[PDB]
Structure formats: structure tokens, C-alpha cells
Ligand binder design. Sequence first.
Ligand SMILES: *C(=N)CNC(=O)[C@H](Cc1cccc(-c2nnc(C=N)o2)c1)NC(=O)c1cc(C(C)(C)C)nn1C
Length: 213
Amino acid sequence: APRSVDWREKGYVTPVKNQGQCGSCWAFSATGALEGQMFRKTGRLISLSEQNLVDCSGPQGNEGCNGGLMDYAFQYVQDNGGLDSEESYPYEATEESCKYNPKYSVANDAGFVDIPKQEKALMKAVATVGPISVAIDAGHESFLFYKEGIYFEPDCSSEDMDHGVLVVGYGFNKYWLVKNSWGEEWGMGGYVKMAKDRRNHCGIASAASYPTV
Ligand SMILES: *C(=N)CNC(=O)[C@H](Cc1cccc(-c2nnc(C=N)o2)c1)NC(=O)c1cc(C(C)(C)C)nn1C
């Protein structure tokens, strides 16, 4: 693992998206992690369908706009044998019936991995595998109103994490490079430098995973 990683400079990452008012952060988180692992194996970056996850991942456990888990999404992809592109299956910030069509699938996986709960373990996964799906405690107006700098909230938890995002790299005092799903208008062009190697700040390590590809 090096001193800094930016997986964006290497093709693994698509633009920042906006979840609307739907509470789907787990679909975005999970399509981003699948995005860069699909890039890894195939060398083509393709936008994936967050709506497909929202309408269809119920059987695995996700409650659409009421909530979900990244882990359950990858597990949908596995069980169902695919995900659709965003071309074919566009995002409507709304829960509806499943309109999956294999004739338009472009990603798949054989399950997921749960990274041990350590920041040293998180660093190394990011360093070797790609961007990783994580879950942090956004539950503060501080995070909501973040514009720029090394985000560090004095009263942030390490145990409960309410919001699933994407670690696309890290840098250097030191920071995790985090892609959110609240549009490019939020924070730093949609990204937020989260504090790194500080008693598991905002639980970023606590629940990191990625799709087996
Ligand atoms: C986003 N706008 C709304 N947030 C959620 O839906 C969160 C995201 C989240 C938080 C904490 C962990 C995870 C996650 N994903 N994989 C893993 C474990 N390796 O952890 C995702 N969702 C929840 O808080 C949530 C959803 C549920 C279900 C669907 C099981 C009821 N339970 N929780 C706690």
C-alpha cells in the first residue's frame, strides 16, 4: 500500500450521482463498488442500475427507499445472475416493480467480502482491490453542510453507521477519499475527505465490503 491512492485517476470510478429523496444510499454505494471491480476484471467502466437494486433486491433483504445493505445488493446480483446498466434501467428515486432484463445485463459477481473491522485492513483493501463500499455515521448537520477539508465530527459514533458511501482512495492529518450520492453540488464535487486513522472515525471501517469479481 502506498502513501496515497486515487482510483479515479485510473478509470475505476464514474461521476457522482444524486439519490433524490429515496433512502437508497446502499444502491449507490454498491453500484460504485461493483463499478470498479467490474472495471478491474473487464477494463471497461460502465454505469450500473441503482433502480434494479431498489426494485428487485427485496428477497435478499433490502427495503428499497426505507433502507438496505450493500452486502444484500451484491447477494442479489449473485442470486439473480446480473445487474442492468443505467442506460437500460434509469433511476426514478422511487420504488416500483422489477424491470430486470438479462438481455441488458453488464455486471455480475460471485458474492462479497467483509473486510476485517480494522483501518489498517481498510487501507490495504483500498490499496489493492479498488474502491470499497462502506457505511459511516453521517447523522450530523456537520456532514450535511460539509463543503470542504478533512471532515471530523467531535461527537461522531464508531458503532452505529446510518449511511452507505464509497471509499475511492486515501491521502495525507490523513484522510479517506469518500464518494457520496447527494449530487456534485454537495461537499467537494460530491466527495468528502473523511478523517483517517483516528479511532475508527464515523465507523468508516466498521462495515466495509466489496463484490467478489
Ligand atoms: C441511505 N441513504 C440510507 N441508509 C441505509 O439504508 C443504511 C446503509 C447502511 C448502514 C450501515 C451498514 C450498511 C451495510 N451494508 N452492508 C453492510 C454489512 N457488511 O452494512 C448499510 N442501511 C441501514 O442502516 C440498514 C438497513 C437494514 C435492513 C435492510 C436490513 C433492514 N438494516 N440496517 C441497519
